[PDB]
Specification:
Main location (chain F): endoplasmic reticulum
Helix content of chain C: 25-40%
GO molecular function (chain F): protein transmembrane transporter activity; structural molecule activity
Number of strands of chain B: 4
Strand content of chain B: 5-15%
CATH superfamily of chain B: SecY subunit domain
Shape of chain C: globular
Order of helices and strands of chain B: HHHHHHEEHHHEEHHHHH
Subcellular location (chain F): Endoplasmic reticulum membrane
Family (chain F): Belongs to the SecE/SEC61-gamma family.
Number of domains of chain C: 3
Number of helices of chain B: 14
Protein name (chain F): Protein transport protein SSS1
Largest interface: B-F, 41 and 29 residues
CATH topology of the largest domain in chain C: Immunoglobulin-like
CATH architecture of the largest domain in chain C: Sandwich
CATH class of chain B: Mainly Alpha
Shape of chain B: globular
Chains: A mainly alpha, B mainly alpha, C alpha+beta, D mainly alpha, E mainly alpha, F mainly alpha
CATH class of the largest domain in chain C: Mainly Beta
Helix content of chain B: 55-70%
Number of domains of chain B: 1
Radius of gyration of chain B: 24 Å
Oligomer: heterohexamer
Number of helices of chain C: 17
CATH superfamily of the largest domain in chain C: C2 domain
């Protein structure tokens, strides 16, 4: 079980899974929508 | 960098990823950009590039125009991102030099929303979607705009009353009273009329009826001894992707007249698309030569586009010889003689068809245009044609 | 510009299809009245425990339109923000991250994934020196996972008793609904084992997984006297102490009905009438032509895409019609027309649907299908996925004829067609090849069909 | 060493035939077929000792498989027509 | 206010790389808990009792068993691969298989490295000895 | 200038026109796709119009 986990920790890369993209998009959208509310201080 | 799926996606998820990519693209559409009269880069482009004006989609879908035409692998991503940086700097310094940090922040959030739209293109393009990326958003904005015209709750002040926009007038005038209210609904022109939408449904039905026409060339293959099938040659050939581009160059000449108008008033135009049937008979000559201009230009640009791009008899003859296909009816090496007869008349007459619909629509008066309705229903029918396979 | 007001005159009235809804060759069922007769009420109520809301929506819409017309007749806070982040932030990324979770637990047929890994671990250590019986596959089903989410506290060594009792027609009494859901979900799981076993090129597990569904939907154990034990009135002790070597349906049918009332122990004319009726309508088969057709031209060629064609004839309790006496050029030879030569298999879609089967000891309702396998006799392995055929014609087996055991009009004798495609192309070196094709029932014990076909390839100039 | 092992198996099948057990031999003939040896006469031996146990359908399929491998004079076809008469008796 | 947009940019970049790290870790572990073929194996675990304190037989057994798994796995790979592309196998099970095929070759090289600690040249044939021992389980 | 249209009317003789039934198989699917994307695009702008002024 540990060896399989190591297989993914010693040979990695920086690609993205197709569910992460919606998380990124709602994060960026709410960052900007959230940013506007700072001007409503 | 989105990981491509290793086995093909079934149809049920392939629909939902598109149905949430649209629902994230539109919310990315209508959020107001932070840090903000009537001027613009210009009005005509927005329909070509599918963007709102003044939001964080004001850069448009033109990011993925770059990395398509650039390649026409990580270096593709970084070259598109620096080209996006350049285009964003152009839009922020030419458009609406007050201060530094608002400008610095504007470049950043246009860069990030450009990155998100370029990501969703790669997501739908790798195989989770069911079509290309550029095609889907440019269908969606046209659909949203024609439904915004046909139904809207927006009111008109400063006139004679509180006037509505769309088919809301048909029910609203039931309240105010006498039988002229139907005539007052059907003919008035400051707002979009219900006669126009009863013509919009008609042109929308007619283009679907034309879209199914084809010619079935019967093939009996000989390399792998079976597979007696068809070759469809559609009437709407080359998928009318240069034709919008054709109009784009039409649209692009308009950029030079405005520049001259704002640069020099002194000097040492009928080619604009006419808008109504009433002033159509005002000049009999100019409308006639205008429709010959549109018809001839669509015909000749499709006639070239077969040659410069992908599909032409000089190549499709080779594509039949290497793939092993042989046409029926004792046509042993007359595939060229058969195919040169039939394919460019299909292409040129299809270009004339698209042009005739283009001028008859806007003369007839339609919510949208001819090019807009045609570019929408061609790609929706493309989705249905790919899915027919199921 | 600055203009905002809610509760417009018509915005509610314009958005506010019941009227549209208001505007909006068969095969007969001999068993549909009969199937409810021989069931108990514990099965019937279990079915019974397992549309107009649009008409309610139209009613509420008409009432709201009338209320808005009455509202027109009288003339003639940041809380919206905090829901939107609630509507978009929390809700939307949740369900999709549920959805893409849950549809990553299934597979293309509808099995949970640890059951798939369970079958492949169950299959990978199978040695050939074990004999596959029905009890082995009744064990490997009992190790599954979909039964655990139906009932959590039960153990897999405890499920097998609950599933053995259905075969031998016992009664647990306390757990009856549990056993009912187990034998309902027997089907989709057993075709899952079939689809795993056809990937390993294994034959015996495939034939066992067909035989187990043959045994479940009739509730009889693995017996060599099984053909009569599916009949819906039997005395088991009388048939085993008579010890008559009848051992099939045809040998039971070739003798007289008074001897039937003797050997089955049936004494009532209504019960024996229904028993002989259902013993009539049980479809056997017989082949008449088994051909390797190619869509292009007459003779198979060293790289060709053939599909196989069977010309089958459904019959029961009748003497064998001779393979010469039917006309060879009329019905057995296919049309050669191009619009039926591009895709031949739609010809099969012209045929009717199979009637409802008869199973009282099975919970749901079942339209009988016909599984079919292909295999290579060069080595003895399976060759592609099994195919489930559900469009054939039972008009030949009708209760109108009933006179074989002399008009004899040849038009009425329906000849059914079966086409099976090969996902593999032809071989390359020219020479004789041998294939072996099985096509089996799924609901009765009737007669299987395991024929062989000599793929003779030649070279055509 | 494997041909000597399978020849030992075949001689053991021979002695088990002379003793007279019929189900015993089938467990080693199926073992010999799952091992990887394909021969004409082994199919005839398996179909014969399966016919003496009076199971018709797999015997007919075993004769058909022996047809499918190679042609043999007057061994396969007599067994096939005998099993066909047996199945004609069995169905009625 | 020149610090503030770069504060924004720093927040967004660090949250992006933090989410990529958390997603990659969870996706790696949920693969590395899933079951596989040849479970319940103990030869690698039985070697530690002899390696605690005559041990060359345990070296032989571990290397022989690992290369037996290697022969079976390089047989079995197209079958589970076709069962992946065909539709019926889990997505995660096939990835766990893809980790197992690398793990056995890592064990194969590590056992040779552990073999050369006493410097015998047995290694050049010793793998093939496993073949005839399977003969004992054969007949 | 008319012989080209004569090639057009020669072409329009060999074409598998959509049938009475076939075209209503097309227009149902395209109509439901178009009405779905239009209803989505309408409801999104109606939701976003009050946010926008409130967002300021």
């Amino acid at each position: 079980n540990s060896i399989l986990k190591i297989y993914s920790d010693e040979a990695t890369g920086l690609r993205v899974d197709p569910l992460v993209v919606l998380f990124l998009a709602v994060g960026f959208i709410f960052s900007v929508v959230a940013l506007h509310v700072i001007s409503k201080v | 960098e989105v990981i491509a799926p290793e086995r093909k996606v079934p149809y049920n998820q392939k629909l939902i990823w598109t149905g949430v990519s649209l629902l994230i693209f539109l919310i990315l559409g209508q959020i107001p950009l932070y840090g903000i009269e009537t001027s613009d880069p210009l009005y005509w482009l927005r329909a070509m590039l599918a963007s709102n004006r003044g939001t964080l989609l004001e850069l448009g879908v033109s990011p993925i125009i770059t990395s398509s035409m650039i390649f026409q692998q990580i270096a593709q991503k970084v070259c598109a991102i620096i080209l996006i940086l350049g285009q964003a700097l152009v839009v922020v310094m030419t458009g609406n030099d007050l201060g530094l940090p608002i400008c610095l922040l504007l470049i950043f959030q246009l860069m990030f929303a450009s990155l998100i739209v370029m990501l969703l293109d790669e997501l739908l393009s790798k195989g989770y979607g069911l079509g290309s990326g550029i095609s889907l958003f440019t269908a969606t904005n046209i659909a949203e705009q024609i439904f915004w015209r046909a139904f809207a709750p927006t009111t008109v002040n400063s006139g004679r009353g509180k006037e509505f926009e769309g088919a809301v007038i048909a029910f609203f005038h039931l309240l105010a009273v006498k039988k002229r209210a139907l005539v007052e609904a059907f003919y008035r022109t400051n707002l979009p009329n219900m006669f126009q939408v009863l013509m919009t449904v008609a042109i929308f039905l007619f283009v679907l009826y034309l879209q199914g026409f084809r010619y079935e060339l019967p093939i009996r293959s000989t390399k792998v001894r079976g597979q007696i099938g068809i070759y469809p040659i559609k009437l709407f050939y080359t998928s009318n992707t240069p034709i919008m581009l054709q109009s784009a160059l039409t649209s692009n000449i308009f950029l030079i007249s405005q520049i001259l108008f704002q640069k020099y008033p002194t000097n040492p135009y009928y080619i604009q698309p006419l808008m109504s049937l009433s002033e159509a008979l005002l000049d009999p000559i100019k409308t006639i030569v205008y429709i010959t201009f549109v018809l001839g230009s669509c015909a000749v640009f499709s006639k070239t586009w077969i040659e410069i791009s992908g599909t032409s008899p000089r190549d499709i003859a080779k594509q039949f010889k290497d793939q092993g296909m042989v046409i029926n009816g004792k046509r042993e090496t007359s595939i060229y003689r058969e195919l040169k007869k039939i394919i460019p008349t299909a292409a040129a007459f299809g270009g004339a068809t698209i042009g005739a619909l283009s001028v008859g629509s806007d003369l007839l008066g339609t919510l949208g245009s001819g090019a807009s309705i045609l570019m929408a229903t061609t790609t929706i029918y493309g989705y249905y044609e790919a899915a027919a396979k199921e | 510009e600055y203009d905002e007001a809610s509760e417009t005159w018509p915005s509610f009235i314009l958005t506010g299809m019941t009227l549209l809804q208001i505007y909006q060759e068969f095969n007969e069922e001999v068993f549909k009245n009969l199937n409810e007769e021989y069931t108990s009420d514990e099965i019937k109520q279990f079915r019974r425990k397992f549309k107009i809301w649009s008409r309610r929506n139209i009613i509420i819409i008409v009432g709201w339109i009338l209320v808005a017309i009455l509202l027109q007749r009288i003339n003639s806070s940041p809380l919206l923000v905090v829901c939107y982040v609630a509507l978009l932030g929390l809700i939307l990324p949740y369900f999709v991250s549920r959805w893409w979770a849950r549809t990553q637990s299934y597979t293309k047929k509808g099995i949970h994934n640890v059951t798939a890994s369970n079958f492949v671990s169950n299959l990978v250590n199978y040695k050939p020196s074990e004999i596959v019986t029905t009890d082995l596959i009744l064990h490997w089903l009992s190790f599954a996972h979909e039964f655990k989410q139906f009932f959590p506290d039960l153990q897999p060594t405890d499920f097998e008793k609950l599933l053995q009792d259905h075969i031998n027609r016992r009664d647990s009494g306390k757990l009856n609904n549990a056993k009912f859901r187990i034998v309902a979900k027997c089907h989709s799981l057993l075709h899952g084992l079939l689809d795993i076993a056809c990937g390993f090129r294994n034959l015996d597990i495939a034939l066992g997984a067909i035989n187990t569904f043959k045994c479940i939907v009739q509730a009889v154990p693995l017996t060599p006297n099984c053909q009569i034990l599916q009949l819906p009135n039997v005395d088991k002790e009388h048939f085993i102490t008579k010890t008559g070597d009848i051992h099939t349906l045809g040998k039971l049918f070739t003798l007289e009905d008074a001897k039937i009332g003797e050997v089955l122990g049936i004494k009532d004319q209504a019960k024996l009438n229904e028993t002989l009726r259902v013993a009539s309508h049980i479809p056997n088969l017989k082949i008449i032509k088994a051909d390797f057709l190619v869509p292009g031209e007459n003779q198979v060629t060293p790289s060709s895409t053939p599909y196989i064609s069977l010309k089958v004839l459904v019959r029961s309790a009748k003497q064998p019609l001779i393979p010469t006496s039917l006309i060879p050029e009329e019905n057995l030879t296919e049309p050669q027309d191009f619009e039926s030569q591009r895709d031949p298999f739609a010809m099969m879609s012209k045929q009717p649907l199979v009637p409802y089967s008869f199973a009282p000891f099975f919970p749901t309702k079942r339209r009988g299908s016909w599984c079919c396998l292909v295999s290579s006799q060069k080595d003895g392995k399976i060759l592609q996925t099994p195919i489930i055929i559900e469009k054939l014609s039972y008009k030949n087996l009708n209760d109108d004829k009933d006179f074989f055991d002399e008009k004899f009009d040849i038009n009425d004798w329906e000849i059914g067609t079966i086409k099976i495609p090969l996902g593999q192309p032809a071989p390359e070196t020219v020479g004789d090849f041998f294939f072996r094709v099985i096509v089996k029932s799924t609901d009765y014990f009737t007669t299987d069909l395991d024929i062989t076909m000599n793929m003779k390839v030649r070279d055509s100039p | 060493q494997l041909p000597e092992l399978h020849f030992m198996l075949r001689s053991k099948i021979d002695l088990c035939l002379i003793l007279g057990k019929h189900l015993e031999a089938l467990q080693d003939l199926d073992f010999l077929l799952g091992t990887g040896l394909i021969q004409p006469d082994v199919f005839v031996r398996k179909a014969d000792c399966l016919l003496k146990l009076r199971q018709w359908e797999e015997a007919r399929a075993t004769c058909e498989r022996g047809l499918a491998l190679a042609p043999e004079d007057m061994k396969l076809r007599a067994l096939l027509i005998e099993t066909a008469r047996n199945l004609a008796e069995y169905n009625g | 206010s020149v610090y503030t947009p770069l504060i924004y940019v720093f927040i967004l970049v660090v949250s992006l790389v933090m989410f990529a790290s958390s997603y990659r870790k969870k996706q790696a572990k949920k693969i590395s808990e899933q079951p596989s073929i040849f479970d319940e194996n103990d030869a690698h675990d039985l070697y530690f009792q002899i390696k605690e304190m005559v041990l060359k037989a345990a070296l032989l057994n571990r290397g022989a068993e690992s290369v037996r798994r290697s022969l079976k796995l390089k047989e079995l790979a197209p079958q589970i691969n076709l069962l992946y592309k065909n539709g019926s196998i889990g997505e995660d099970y096939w990835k766990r298989f893809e980790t197992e095929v690398k793990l056995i070759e890592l064990e194969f090289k590590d056992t040779l490295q552990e073999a050369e600690r006493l410097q015998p040249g047995w290694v050049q044939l010793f793998v093939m000895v496993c073949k005839e021992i399977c003969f004992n389980q054969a007949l | 200038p008319v012989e080209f249209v004569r090639e057009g009317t020669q072409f329009l003789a060999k074409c598998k026109k959509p049938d009475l039934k076939e075209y209503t198989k097309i227009v149902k699917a395209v109509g439901i796709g178009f009405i779905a994307v239009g209803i989505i695009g309408y409801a999104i702008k109606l939701i976003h119009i009050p946010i926008r002024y409130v967002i300021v």
